[PDB]
Amino acid sequence: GEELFTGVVPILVELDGDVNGHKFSVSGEGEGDATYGKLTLKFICTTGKLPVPWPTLVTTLVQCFARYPDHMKQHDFFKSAMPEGYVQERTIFFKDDGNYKTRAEVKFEGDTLVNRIELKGIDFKEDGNILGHKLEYNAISDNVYITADKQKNGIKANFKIRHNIEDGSVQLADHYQQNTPIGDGPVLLPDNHYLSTQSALSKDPNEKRDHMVLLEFVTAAGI
């Protein structure tokens, strides 16, 4: 499956969301180059205004583009599941606020790597940091800690994202993740390791729709 990632691969992302009954959709396009762990993406809210802050969607909106060091390549579950792909599920607990539950299918459609997502958010506070849009449009960076899940023939992960709040404080988002192959072929069940991930958020000065530009680097480490 790793052979499918040796060059630059087009990416498409499609998300339908419902957070406390606020419905929305997001589409994204860009490119990934796993040789360098490099992702360039642009997302648009296709339904109008996004009802949650963009930074809170970054993690949900393709870890198959991680750069695995040569000495770690037998620990890359993500690429091993391709082209058939994998289901990626999360619960994201926003401290003192609501939660997102996400289910996504990541697979090739031809030469394009597609991430199709449903997101459901509940128990958010109307005037909290998410629905109240109190988070800075700021980068996120952290380590995704992966372990094998032999019983789903896949992986689990956990990590924290600390989103800056406009008052100088932090909104914690505790992520719990599980990935399961879609196909029935052999996949790589890894030893414990992590993905060092950094996402830089920006705006396209010519884009009038509600949107997010991302430049992201993802590198496997810890072995």
From Swiss-Prot:
Changing residue 196 to F: reported impact? Answer: In H9; increases fluorescence at 395 nm excitation
What effect is documented for mutating residue 36 to N?
In EBFP1.2; shifts the excitation and emission spectra to shorter wavelengths and increases quantum yields compared to BFP
Does this UniProt record's set of keywords contain Chaperone?
no
Q: What is the effect of changing residue 218 to R?
A: In Azurite; shifts the excitation and emission spectra to shorter wavelengths and increases quantum yields compared to BFP
Biotechnology comment: Green fluorescent protein has been engineered to produce a vast number of variously colored mutants, fusion proteins, and biosensors. Further generation of mutants led to more stable proteins (at 37 degrees Celsius for example) with brighter fluorescence and longer fluorescence lifetimes.
| Pfam families xref list | GFP
**According to its UniProt record, in which tissues is this protein expressed?**
Photocytes.
Q: How does it assemble?
A: Monomer.
Return the similarity comment.
Belongs to the GFP family.
The name this protein carries in UniProt is: Green fluorescent protein
Q: Which organism is it from?
A: Aequorea victoria
Q: What is the lineage of its organism?
A: Eukaryota, Metazoa, Cnidaria, Hydrozoa, Hydroidolina
